[PDB]
Amino acid sequence: ESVHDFTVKDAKENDVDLSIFKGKVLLIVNVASKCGMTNSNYAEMNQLYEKYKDQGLEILAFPCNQFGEEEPGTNDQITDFVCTRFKSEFPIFDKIDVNGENASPLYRFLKLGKWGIFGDDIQWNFAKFLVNKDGQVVDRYYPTTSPLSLERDIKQLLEIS
């Protein structure tokens, strides 16, 4: 009934119980390393993280190769890439499918959000979802909406003026 009922695998194929993120607002993003939007999204995510990580924001990055095969590497290559180019401090999880019958259970839940308004297939790399502290998905954004465009909603969810 909430995002906390789910478990996903980390970059090393180990389970991570999402309930450990209770009390935090989640910015969930499907990522890709070889996309035209890669540099701007990771960079902007870094800015949001630095500014809000200590205020309740957690960013979950899920690699996905279902869009133009722009995330073809292994988990190690993906994490090594981010480690080198972006130095991101938020977690990078195991590669997953976001659409189709093998889509992660987490994403199926995300798509049930807001009366089914979020039912659409993930359109491309870097779609975003925001989950409130109550563990319910409240916002979804098209891949073309860069991370910084979500700051207003992030502040609202973190109750920051």
Add this chain to the structure above:
Amino acid sequence: ESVHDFTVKDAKENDVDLSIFKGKVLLIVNVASKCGMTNSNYAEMNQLYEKYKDQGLEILAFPCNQFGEEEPGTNDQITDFVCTRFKSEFPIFDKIDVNGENASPLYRFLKLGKWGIFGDDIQWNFAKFLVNKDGQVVDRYYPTTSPLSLERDIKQLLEI
């Protein structure tokens, strides 16, 4: 092509060449009067208009009764509603369909935005689209994203 190559009907069934909005950033929204999102969306659209109308922003509202039949009235009743409760100043166009075989050509075009990334059917009342001064659709937002959440992108498009 671009949004400028389209013609739509205003609240008086009269034609309006959207090319008349060239040079302006456009916030295109499908509206409804009897929805729980109605109040906050109109209120925030008003706020955006007050702040950016003079800076190049134009808000084009398109009524649509395809979602829970929450826009059942006539154009007169709709504009009446809007005026009485929000006194909105942005153009309110003729009621249309956004999905289906009777969908307005405009929305069929908006959905072609960003290499097909904007191809999804309009999810519900109040989905939003941002069009640059050159008539190209550059941003789309889910119904649940309130108007104020688009301010950062609007400012970028207006270069402020």
